[PDB]
């Protein structure tokens, strides 16, 4: 959207989308994307970034 | 070309400032023209008197 | 208008329009005027987490 601020200002608002590590679908270079990477499999653990 | 989506906001702000200045200039020109019209009418009335 | 002062004198009146650096529309020598001036309301901003 195009938003004009109250104090005589104009700016353009944008909607952001993240492609960090779960929505990249075969990262080109690092080969660390959602596919083409290894997933840890254990009963009582959690993967933190 | 190849702006980088960072200085585009500054460019938009500068364009808006120029547009506002030109709008003020146009308003001043219209006011001047109205003043000339009023002055001409008054001068014609005074010459008639 | 043309005004004859009461104290035995005459003069001519004029309407003044100022061509400053705000309503110059492409200054022909220094390129200082509506161009090259920013007067921007703000600066490019980014919201971070």
UniProtKB/Swiss-Prot annotation, chains A, C:
It is found in: Secreted; Bacterial flagellum. Flagellin is the subunit protein which polymerizes to form the filaments of bacterial flagella. Homomer of FlaA is able to form a functional filament. Belongs to the bacterial flagellin family. This is Flagellin A. The chain holds residues 150 to 198 of 395 of the full protein.
């Amino acid at each position: 959207s195009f938003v004009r601020d109250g104090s005589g200002s104009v700016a353009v608002k944008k909607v952001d989308y993240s492609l960090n590590a779960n929505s990249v679908l075969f990262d080109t270079v690092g080969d660390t994307g959602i596919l083409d990477k290894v997933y840890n499999v254990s009963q009582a653990s959690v993967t933190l970034t | 070309v190849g702006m980088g989506a960072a200085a585009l906001d500054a460019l938009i702000s500068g364009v808006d400032a120029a547009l506002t200045d030109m709008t003020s200039a146009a308003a001043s020109l219209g006011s001047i023209s109205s003043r000339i019209d009023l002055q001409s009418e008054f001068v014609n009335k005074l010459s008639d008197s």
